[PDB]
């Protein structure tokens, strides 16, 4: 059935709850971002109001074929009334089009649902600063102190410097980047830019990217693989067998591949600095695993919550085991006791 943590009290609202059939009592279905664990169940057959950002709304229409009449895009940073309740969408610093939702309940309670987010100090100067939030529905993906990772800017600098050196030493090397969803576009775009190439990809993936309102996008991507020296492929194909295969396809235009796998966290983070990362190599193929995250580190999540000072926290991730639930709850208490709320 629909879990309680997908339901917003005192409203007829749900959040990221599209795989339970008709949810009894639900008058509006909010969608925080276009990732499949969250949109699961949507299709052209859906006949209830969907509320979301403009970008998420472009992907609903084009990729899932949801009917225009049921898509209700809202602008960010703007007080909006939905079925008699004041809401606000905010940038979640996750993938394109990803939002957090502020609900202002008729009774005076204020609820923030983060969706999926990477907490940032810039959030402390949005409309969140203007009033008190009583309840926080929190993206707890990396809610444990072992989860450190570098800034996004540091990771992109590593990737750009690595690719530029490799191709300047060998102008017949190909660069390949993995993808399985929207997000982490800066990886392949920043590498393409430093190399003076467009990024080459399949028709399906090009269509996906053309929904994202990225400025000057026609100048950065293409479906002509032959004219491009940065290729995007399915994350599944980022391994030695899949890469040798792909190299054969290019017809002797290239004699080396340098590939990037943007992972979330991986255990070499607890030991290794970004400056010290190394590839796995077999022959003329090298694969780099780089920790580009679009979720909060443990310290970023902690700072956000200690700034916000909510009265109650409802986790939306890792809720499936008693061990994880009990661990999260202990961090919440530490944080509250250290900060004094």
CB of 180 to Ni ion, least distance (A): 12
When the beta carbons of 59 and 175 are compared against Ni ion, the nearer one is 59
Sheet holding 230-234, edge to edge: 221-222, 199-200, 230-234, 173-179, 256-262, 285-290, 280-282
When the beta carbons of 118 and 302 are compared against Ni ion, the nearer one is 118
Q: Give the N- to C-terminal CA distance of the chain in Å, as an integer.
A: 34
When the beta carbons of 58 and 256 are compared against Ni ion, the nearer one is 58
> Which one of residues 116, 139, 185, 300 is an interface residue with Ni ion (CB under 5 A)?
116
When the beta carbons of 113 and 198 are compared against Ni ion, the nearer one is 113
Q: What does residue 231 show for φ and ψ, rounded to 5 degrees?
A: -100, 135
User: What is the spatial distance between Cα 161 and Cα 165, in angstroms, rounded to a whole number?
Assistant: 6
CB of 187 to Ni ion, least distance (A): 16
CB of 17 to Ni ion, least distance (A): 15
Q: Which of 235, 226, 223, 293 is nearest to 259 (CA)?
A: 235
Cα Rg of the chain (Å, integer)? 22
> Considering CB under 5 A, how many residues would be counted as binding Ni ion?
2
Site residues (CB under 5 A) for Ni ion, limited to 175-194: none
Neighbours of 27 (CB within 10 A): 15
Diameter of the chain measured on Cα atoms: 68
Q: Kindly indicate which of the ranges 34-42, 69-77, 135-143, 305-313 contains the residues binding Ni ion, using the contact rule CB under 5 A.
A: 34-42
CB of 33 to Ni ion, least distance (A): 6
Q: What does residue 177 show for φ and ψ, rounded to 5 degrees?
A: -130, 135
CB of 94 to Ni ion, least distance (A): 6
Query: For Ni ion, what does the binding mask look like between residues 57 and 96, x meaning CB under 5 A?
Result: ----------------------------------------
User: What is the spatial distance between Cα 143 and Cα 295, in angstroms, rounded to a whole number?
Assistant: 10
Query: If DSSP codes are grouped into helix, strand and coil, which group holds residue 3?
Result: coil
35 sits near Ni ion (criterion: CB under 5 A): yes
User: What is the spatial distance between Cα 341 and Cα 337, in angstroms, rounded to a whole number?
Assistant: 7
CB of 128 to Ni ion, least distance (A): 20
Q: Kindly indicate which of the ranges 22-30, 110-118, 131-139, 279-287 contains the residues binding Ni ion, using the contact rule CB under 5 A.
A: 110-118
Q: Is residue 128 within 8 Å of residue 112, measured between CB atoms?
A: yes
139 sits near Ni ion (criterion: CB under 5 A): no
When the beta carbons of 116 and 185 are compared against Ni ion, the nearer one is 116
CB of 147 to Ni ion, least distance (A): 16
Where on the chain is the footprint of Ni ion (CB under 5 A)? 35, 116
């Amino acid at each position: 059935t629909c879990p309680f943590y997908k339901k917003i009290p005192g409203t007829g609202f749900t959040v990221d709850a599209f795989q339970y059939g008709v949810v009894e009592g639900c008058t509006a279905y909010f969608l925080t971002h276009f990732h499949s664990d969250h949109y699961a169940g949507l299709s052209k057959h859906f006949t209830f109001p969907v509320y979301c950002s403009e970008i998420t709304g472009n992907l609903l229409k084009n990729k899932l074929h949801v009917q225009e009449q049921y898509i209700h895009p809202l602008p960010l940073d703007t007080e909006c009334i939905v079925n008699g309740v004041k809401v606000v969408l905010l940038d979640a610093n996750h993938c394109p089009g990803a939002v957090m939702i502020l609900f202002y309940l008729p009774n005076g309670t204020v609820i923030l649902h983060t969706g999926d987010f990477r907490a940032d100090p810039s959030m402390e100067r949005s409309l969140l600063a203007d009033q008190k939030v009583h309840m926080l529905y929190l993206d707890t993906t990396y809610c444990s102190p072992e989860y450190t990772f570098p800034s996004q800017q540091e990771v992109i600098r590593f990737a750009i410097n690595t690719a530029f050196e490799a191709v300047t030493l060998n102008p017949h090397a190909l660069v390949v980047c993995g993808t399985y969803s929207i997000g982490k576009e800066k990886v392949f775009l920043a590498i393409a830019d430093v190399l003076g190439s467009k990024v080459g990809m399949s028709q399906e993936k090009y269509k996906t990217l053309q929904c994202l309102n990225i400025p000057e996008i026609n100048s950065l991507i293409t479906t002509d693989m032959c004219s491009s020296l940065v290729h995007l492929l399915p994350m599944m194909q980022i391994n030695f067998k899949g890469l040798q295969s792909h190299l054969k396809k290019c017809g002797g235009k290239y004699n080396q591949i340098l590939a990037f796998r943007p992972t979330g966290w991986t255990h070499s983070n607890k030991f290794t600095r970004i400056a010290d990362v190394i590839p796995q190599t077999k022959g003329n193929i090298s694969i780099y695993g780089i920790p580009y995250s679009e979720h909060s580190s443990y310290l970023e999540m902690k700072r956000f919550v200690q700034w916000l000072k909510p009265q109650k926290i409802i986790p939306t991730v890792n809720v499936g085991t008693w061990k994880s639930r009990s661990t999260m709850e202990k961090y919440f208490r530490e944080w509250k006791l250290e900060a004094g709320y």
